[PDB]
Write a structure and sequence with these properties.
Chain D: This is Activated factor Xa heavy chain. By secondary structure, chain A is mainly beta. Chain A has four helices and 28 strands. The termini of chain C are far apart. Classes of the chains: A mainly beta, B mainly beta, C little secondary structure, D little secondary structure.
Chain lengths: 709, 641, 69, 254
């Protein structure tokens, strides 16, 4: 029943696409266009609000609670009668802000006839059914706009955020009680070419900021912050945003990425950690010709101290001398597998060797592997683990996992390593950070070919996810020196940020099994850094150059899986009692969502049983799937032609009768057979079999939780 | 299931379903050479399934199969054209015996025989129903699937060869032909259809085929919504309905929309802990969730896009009144069935004289003699020359000594253009080829309708009664905007503190009158308000508390069990939050309106008023009169937000 | 009295081929023999006139229920 | 709601009470034939002696000449985990044969085929037992047999801290009321399949029995066919007619 009255007035402001407070670059300004944006005013519309620096072209951020009234007052000052169309429920057609053929009374258009210079108060409210009061965040944002012309009521700056939070733990302004900050985000594409002033200026301006000139979000530590995931684009455009280092908690779930469309009503909150300079990686492959970068400036203001314990609470440590050895070698790896099965003649007899006199056999494709000792020449085996190929192998993290990535480059370009959303030490980098301070807190990831560097950091209990989600979260890692070119060169893998199921030094995955992933990255040779090892240097036909032709272009545009461009060597034929965790990923040069249809097969996610799923780039999607089926079918997609006609899968799933291990070949055992000695599922130990952990000979301290109490 | 090659029209907005503009000439051809499905109750032809009122969402798509646990319906198919057709389902882990996809198999002519159907030859084929589609967790109970051809993954979804597989749970079933309903679920398939990308491509286009149709970019690939364009019918619900909406998208893989309702918050079931508000869509899955309406009116249904709204979907859904059970033409004297049309009558009794319980042995409906009545065509065109919405019609016979005389069965029809008689009302949701009727004579019988039927040329037709065809069908309609609801001026919700009387008549050596019962159908002493004086000075003020939108009015009158008096004219005084006893302004000019009271003795007065009466203290001052002052004042307001 | 080979209300559905699901409407083992299904109980039980359910014969074989009270 | 109703004095034979020579019981058994009694292995190992009596509906009282089924010696099991619980099935080697009476009704032998058709259909079950698995403060004098439903396998490994294999699964209500350690240990969780009765569960204590309203632990003898077959044919024909039929076998159950 609270009165949340606001005074918004739209006007045309010649706002530059770059924050230039100094009049030195105004004579040669590369941006000088008008923008009709929303601007808040005082009662009776006297003086203009100063507005935050983050809200360049964004209007006033409206805030409200449940069961309250919102007598918002608007005064248009542009040129055409605009309106305000929120996302409430109590507002009627007389005050809805939508001008269309309603087939009702003509007097219902009084909310849209707001002439430029006429005041009009909208009598709106909200019902009680707009409050979650559960596992959702205490706020439910909304987007209000003008229903006149969406092509103009957005590119000019006619966008504003509306907040309908929960009455109780919220203050006056949109900030919670236990949280001391309110971070509002906005990522838009102001297409100036399609608006009111038809001027050729197709530029990707995030809130009117180009080349990463967006004002940096800054907040000191020892406090709590709250986010607001908002930002509508011109239409079907998305934004692959990510919060490096600092992990948020969207929908009370510890996540670090969010990529939807049309500004989805979602807010989040988290708790800051140590001081530093983190990154807001706005890595949008389809939106990079203009510029969109941001970072995090975490200082240190000593105000309150939490009970955050560093190590686990007197039961879990597992201090082991296990450092992951990674050497950026240039072993001979090609798009086609070693001796292909389905005969990939398009790459075997054209680019794999000296056939057709194109590239050759000796390549420089660098792959991130994992050795077993300090040799930097052979891993667990001489080749690879087959099940991953050029993709990264199996890496698991736990408390004191000693993630000491002994990286020693030896190719022709300085590389590094960076796991997705991991907090490190002020001494070692392992993250594309610009934090260059003193020698004590310096961090440089530049590892020249020949020099070795170890990124030492102790992953502990403050680096684990929640409890309701899956065990090990999928976080694909990639090089931090380069952004888009190293991914095409085969420098990408996957990391398992698991929960608190640390049993021994390796962490026994309780109620789990093996892992089956699925990657589909479409890249090009021109995107990779080793473009010189194709047609110019590593070449044997200087008279005929395979360029400027569609034949050589599509020969590089390929979708790979486990380092195998045609088809993989393994099948998805599981059996019963397979509590595995399926992972999916599909990075590349795209930005929207990617889907895949499953015929005759389904999965389990969200306490239900869906058929198909939809993954997201940047981050990694994980789901615990139990593969129980008898027969064989296809897993094709429904798109155009280069991604729907050859993206099938041939496998046979059979379980006769339990896990099918009495007359076939599979790495499982029901057992259900003659057991006269020792077989599978025979956990008979002399001291004690199992229970929860192995802190002592019997574990005498009784406090096994799943995080900070 | 069938698949006869019938040319379907994508640009269906020229039919003027809910469109406004008239200068919408089609540059190319309206219809497109495609194939439509059909449902058969038998294995052979010459027997189709009549598309009922509930079977609305289909357009170019054929029927929708409803098979659940312990219930299987055959799907015999026979090719009619010259190309072999296919049929492939999705969802469960069905084997190749009921799959029908063109790939590797095992059986010779059984796993892939359904993909190659020879013309003029039937084939034995039947699908299997599972329990996987049942939504787990306490919340939902339905989750639809999809099925299409399989001879080509792309040339079939554009050839009109689509179909959704709506599968619910088991436990809640209805008596509608043993089909589980007990709700009002909807299903919509949004997917564009292309003529140049299909098997029935006639090598050329209907206008030009140089740079993908020189007239319009992909003119053959129109964004047909639900098989049509600018249509979307059946969106006529009531206030506060938690109906389930099934959103299915299989072909549109590069078209992401976000559904946002104008003033309707969302509520997710299952977990019972989420509110959301908005809910987009992803390609592949079959999203389904409730709606939960709030305020009535023509609320626009859009997806907040620029390419699929003004050129795709733009149909506002209407919410009509729920408690619109007011008298229409029985208790009033203005609205009557004077515009009735028919052909064959039933006897010699009076036509209009068909009131419930009337004096005389002649009270029915007839003009010409009946002679012989059977399964001929005694149609009774009940035309109203306006929009209609009927949810229930009563039926009562006649007697005068002992005989029953009641109609046992009668079929109903309807029409919307007079030139064609769409005799299909008898096959609605529950009905298939029959309809209820009267049972006796002294017991009133009603026939309630389930689907919100809308038309203009209503047609009823009797059959045979108890050796005397006599029918007395009443009239019960409803509102169109959905807000004109009785505030209680005649029921009892509006107390006497709001509607007050003037003077109280009291005799010296006797009793005293109580003229404060100004309601409809009152007993006791008087029946309404009768002041002591008899001039143009008395008043009858009403307190509306808040502002309202009054459109319909009614007025009968009272008496004193001797003489009947009424009022012939009055004036309505409108005001605002404060107090202002000023008559209602005339919108057609600038003066005040001169309202008319009761015309005859007991015949009510029904009139519509487009301009709202935004006021709170409405005053009624009777100008002229008849004998004495008497009127049963009762209006119909709205809830202006 | 419609012709044979066609069953249902107006004799539309054909004869049943395999049992597989729902145990073939018989209270014992369902095992198809290439478009031929036949159910039959082993020892301790007999058969009925058509084969809908095995008629109980023995008083207490290896699996019954006492409905005396 | 069907609560803890006692067993009937008609169709409830599967209750071979395993007591001691004194007035002190320990667990129970399962009646199937005249040469093998399925029960838990901890009934005898790490316990006391063994005294069986079939058709005994009450321990304190006696319903006449009906409880007689003495046992000579007994052995153990190969897969029986001494610390935890896994394949906890033991066979009681009776010494005197008992005919088929009213309170002693035989049952047909299970098979591996009734593993994919009995768990998906019969989602319930009954737990026959005098009440010796949770012998704390609910020792009822009457033979109680309540009804417990079946839950998905993905909710049984977390019911107890011990990781449960495939042999044992859920067989109780949700986390609401007391539905675990019901009846005597080794109690038959027979599920009336179709015209027959096949036992498919043995109640045993894991970490004891306390506040276990989550789920229950019950074995699956359909996979135990290879053990009941190796201990019935390899022992040979009954020498002295159930002596031992036949207790003279190795400890890992042959």
């Amino acid at each position: 029943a609270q009165l949340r009255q606001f005074y918004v007035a739209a006007q045309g402001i010649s706002w530059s696409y770059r924050p230039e407070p100094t009049n030195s670059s105004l004579n040669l300004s590369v941006t000088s266009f008008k923008k009709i944006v929303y601007r808040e005013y005082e009662p009776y519309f006297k003086k203009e609000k100063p507005q935050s620096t983050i809200s360049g072209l964004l209007g006033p951020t409206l805030y409200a609670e449940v069961g309250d009234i919102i007598k918002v007052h608007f005064k248009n000052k542009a040129d055409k009668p605009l309106s305000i169309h929120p996302q409430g429920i109590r507002y009627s057609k007389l005050s809805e802000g939508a001008s269309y053929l309603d087939h009702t009374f003509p007097a219902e258009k009084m909310d849209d006839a707001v002439a430029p210079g006429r005041e009009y108060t909208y009598e709106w409210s909200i019902s009680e059914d707009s409050g979650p009061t559960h596992d959702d965040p205490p706020c439910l944002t909304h987007i209000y706009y003008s229903h006149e012309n969406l092509i103009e009521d957005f590119n000019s700056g006619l966008i504003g955020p509306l907040l309908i939070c929960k009455k109780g733990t919220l203050t006056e302004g949109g900030t919670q009680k236990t949280f001391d900050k309110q971070i509002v985000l906005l990522f838009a594409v102001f297409d100036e070419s399609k608006s009111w002033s038809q001027s050729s200026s197709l530029m990707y301006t995030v809130n009117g900021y180009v080349n990463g000139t967006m004002p940096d979000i800054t907040v000191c530590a020892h406090d709590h912050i709250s986010w607001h995931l908002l930002g509508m684009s011109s239409g079907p455009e998305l934004f692959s945003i990510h919060f490096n280092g600092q992990v948020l908690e969207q929908n009370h779930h510890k996540v670090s990425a969010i990529t939807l469309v049309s500004a989805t009503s979602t807010t989040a909150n988290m708790t800051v950690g140590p001081e530093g300079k983190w990154i807001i990686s706005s890595l949008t492959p389809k939106h990079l010709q203009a510029g969109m970068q941001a970072y995090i400036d975490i200082k240190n203001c000593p105000k309150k101290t939490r009970n955050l314990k560093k190590i686990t609470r007197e039961q879990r440590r597992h201090m082991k001398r296990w450092e992951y050895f990674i050497a950026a070698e240039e072993v001979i790896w090609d798009y086609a597998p070693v001796i292909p099965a389905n005969m990939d003649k398009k790459y075997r007899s054209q680019h794999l060797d000296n056939f057709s006199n194109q590239i050759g056999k000796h390549y420089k494709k660098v792959m991130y592997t994992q050795y077993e000792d300090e040799s930097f020449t052979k891993h667990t085996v001489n080749p690879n683990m087959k099940e991953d190929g050029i993709l990264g192998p199996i890496i698991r993290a736990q408390v004191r996992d000693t993630l000491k990535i002994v990286f020693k480059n030896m190719a022709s370009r300085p590389y590094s390593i960076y796991p997705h959303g991991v907090t490190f030490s002020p001494y070692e980098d392992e993250v594309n950070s610009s934090f260059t301070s003193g020698r004590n807190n310096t961090m440089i990831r530049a590892v020249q070919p020949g020099e070795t560097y170890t990124y030492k950091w102790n992953i502990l209990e403050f680096d684990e996810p929640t409890e309701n989600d899956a065990q090990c979260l999928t976080r694909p890692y990639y090089s931090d020196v380069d952004i888009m070119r190293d991914i095409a060169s085969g420098l990408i893998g996957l990391l398992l940020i698991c929960k608190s199921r640390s049993l021994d030094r390796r962490g026994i995955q309780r109620a789990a099994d093996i892992e089956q992933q699925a990657v589909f990255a479409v890249f090009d040779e021109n995107k990779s850094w080793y473009l010189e090892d194709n047609i110019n240097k590593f070449c044997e036909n200087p008279d005929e150059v395979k360029r400027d032709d569609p034949k050589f272009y599509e020969s590089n545009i390929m979708s790979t899986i486990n380092g195998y461009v045609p088809e993989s060597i393994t099948t998805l034929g599981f059996c019963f009692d397979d509590t595995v965790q399926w992972h999916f990923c599909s990075v590349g040069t795209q930005n929207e969502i990617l889907t895949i249809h499953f015929t005759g097969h389904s999965f389990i996610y969200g306490k239900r049983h869906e058929d198909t799923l939809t993954l997201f780039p940047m981050r990694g999607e994980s789901v615990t799937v139990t593969m129980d089926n008898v027969g064989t079918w296809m897993l094709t997609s429904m798109n155009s032609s280069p991604r729907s006609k050859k993206l099938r899968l041939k496998f046979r799933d059979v379980k006769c009768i339990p896990d099918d291990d009495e007359d076939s070949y599979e790495i499982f055992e029901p057992p259900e057979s003659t057991v006269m000695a020792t077989r599978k599922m025979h956990d008979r130990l002399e001291p004690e079999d199992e229970e929860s952990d192995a802190d002592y000979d019997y574990q005498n301290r009784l406090a096994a939780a799943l995080g900070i109490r | 299931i069938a698949a006869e090659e019938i040319s379907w029209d994508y640009s269906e907005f020229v039919q003027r379903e809910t469109d406004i503009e008239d200068s919408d000439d089609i540059p190319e051809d309206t219809t497109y050479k495609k194939v439509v499905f059909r449902k058969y109750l038998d294995s052979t032809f010459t027997k189709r399934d009549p598309r009922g009122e509930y079977e609305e969402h289909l357009g170019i798509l054929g029927p929708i199969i409803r098979a659940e646990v312990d219930d299987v319906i055959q799907v015999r198919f026979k090719n009619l054209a010259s190309r072999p057709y296919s049929l492939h389902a999705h969802g469960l882990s069905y084997e190749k015996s009921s799959e029908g996809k063109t790939y590797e198999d095992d059986s010779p002519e059984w796993f892939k025989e359904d993909n190659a159907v020879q013309p003029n030859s039937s084939y034995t084929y039947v699908w299997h129903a599972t329990e996987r589609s049942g939504p787990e967790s306490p919340g939902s109970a339905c989750r639809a699937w999809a099925y299409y051809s399989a001879v080509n993954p792309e040339k079939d979804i554009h050839s009109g060869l689509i179909g959704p597989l709506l599968i619910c749970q088991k436990g809640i079933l209805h008596k509608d032909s043993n089909m589980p309903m007990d709700m009002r679920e909807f299903v919509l398939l949004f997917m564009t259809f292309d003529e140049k990308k299909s098997w029935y491509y006639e090598k050329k286009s209907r206008s030009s085929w140089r740079l993908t149709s020189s007239e319009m970019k992909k003119s053959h690939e129109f964004h047909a919504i639900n098989g049509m364009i600018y249509s979307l019918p059946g969106l006529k619900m009531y206030e506060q309905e938690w109906v389930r909406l099934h959103l299915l998208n299989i072909g549109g893989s590069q078209d992401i929309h976000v559904v946002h309702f104008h003033g309707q918050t969302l509520l997710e079931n299952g977990n019972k802990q989420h509110q959301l508000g908005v809910w987009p869509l992803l390609p592949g899955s079959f999203k389904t969730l409730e709606m939960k309406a709030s305020k009535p009116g023509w609320w626009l249904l859009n997806t907040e896009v620029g390419e699929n709204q003004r050129a795709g979907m733009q149909t506002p859904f209407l919410i009509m009144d729920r408690d619109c059970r007011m008298p229409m033409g029985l208790s009033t004297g203005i609205i009557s069935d004077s515009q009735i049309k028919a052909s064959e009558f039933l006897g010699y009794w009076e036509p209009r004289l068909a009131r419930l319980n009337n004096g005389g042995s002649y009270n029915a409906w007839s003009v010409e003699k009946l002679a012989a009545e059977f399964a001929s065509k005694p149609w009774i065109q009940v035309d109203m020359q306006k929009e209609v919405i009927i949810t229930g019609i009563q039926t009562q016979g006649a007697k005068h000594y002992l005989k029953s005389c009641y109609t046992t069965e009668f079929y109903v029809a309807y029409s919307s253009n007079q030139i064609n008689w769409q005799i299909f009302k008898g096959n609605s949701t529950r009905n298939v080829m029959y309809f209820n009727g009267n049972s006796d004579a002294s017991t009133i019988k009603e026939n309630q309708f389930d689907p919100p039927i809308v038309a203009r040329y209503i047609r009823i037709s009797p059959t045979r009664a108890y050796n005397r065809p006599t029918l007395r069908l009443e009239l019960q309609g409803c509102e169109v905007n959905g807000c004109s609801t009785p505030l209680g001026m005649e029921n009892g919700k509006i107390e006497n503190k709001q509607i007050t009387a003037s003077s109280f008549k009291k005799s010296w050596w006797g009793d005293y009158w109580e003229p404060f019962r100004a309601r409809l159908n009152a007993q006791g002493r008087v029946n309404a308000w009768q002041a002591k004086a008899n001039n143009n000075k008395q008043w009858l003020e009403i307190d509306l508390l808040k502002i309202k939108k009054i459109t319909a009015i009614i007025t009968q009158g009272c008496k004193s069990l001797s003489s009947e008096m009424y009022v012939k004219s009055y004036t309505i005084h409108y005001s605002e939050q404060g107090v202002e006893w000023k008559p209602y302004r005339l919108k057609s000019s600038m003066v005040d309106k001169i309202f008319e009271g009761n015309t005859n003795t007991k015949g009510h007065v029904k009139n519509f008023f487009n301009p709202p009466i935004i006021s709170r203290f409405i005053r009624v001052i009777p100008k002229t009169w008849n004998q004495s002052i008497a009127l049963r004042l009762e209006l119909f307001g709205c809830d202006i937000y | 009295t419609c012709l044979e080979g066609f069953e249902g209300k107006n004799c539309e559905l054909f004869t049943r081929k395999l049992c597989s699901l729902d145990n073939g409407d018989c209270d014992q083992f369902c095992h198809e023999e290439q478009n031929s299904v036949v159910c039959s109980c082993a020892r301790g039980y007999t058969l009925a006139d058509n084969g809908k359910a095995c008629i109980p014969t023995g008083p207490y074989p290896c699996g019954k229920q006492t409905l005396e009270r | 709601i069907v609560g803890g109703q006692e067993c009937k004095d008609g169709e409830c034979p599967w209750q071979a009470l395993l007591i001691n020579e004194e007035n002190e019981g320990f667990c129970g058994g399962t009646i199937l034939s005249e040469f093998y009694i399925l029960t838990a292995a901890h009934c005898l190992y790490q316990a006391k002696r063994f005294k069986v009596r079939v058709g005994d509906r009450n321990t304190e009282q006696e319903e006449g000449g009906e409880a007689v089924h003495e046992v000579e010696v007994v052995i153990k099991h190969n897969r029986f985990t001494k610390e935890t619980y896994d394949f906890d099935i033991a066979v009681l080697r009776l010494k005197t044969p008992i005919t088929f009476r009213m309170n002693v009704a035989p049952a047909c032998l299970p098979e591996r085929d009734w593993a994919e058709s009995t768990l998906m259909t019969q989602k319930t079950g009954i737990v026959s037992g005098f009440g010796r698995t949770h012998e704390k403060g609910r020792q009822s004098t009457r033979l109680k047999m309540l009804e417990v439903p079946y839950v998905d396998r993905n909710s049984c490994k977390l019911s107890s801290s011990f990781i449960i294999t495939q042999n044992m699964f859920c067989a109780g209500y949700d986390t609401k009321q007391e539905d675990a350690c019901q009846g005597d240990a080794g109690g038959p969780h027979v599920t009336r399949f179709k015209d027959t009765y096949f036992v498919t569960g043995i109640v045993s204590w894991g970490e004891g029995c306390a506040r276990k309203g989550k789920y229950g632990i019950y074995t699956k003898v359909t996979a135990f066919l290879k053990w009941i077959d190796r201990s019935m044919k390899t022992r040979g024909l009954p020498k002295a007619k159930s002596h031992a039929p036949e207790v003279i076998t190795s400890s890992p159950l042959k």
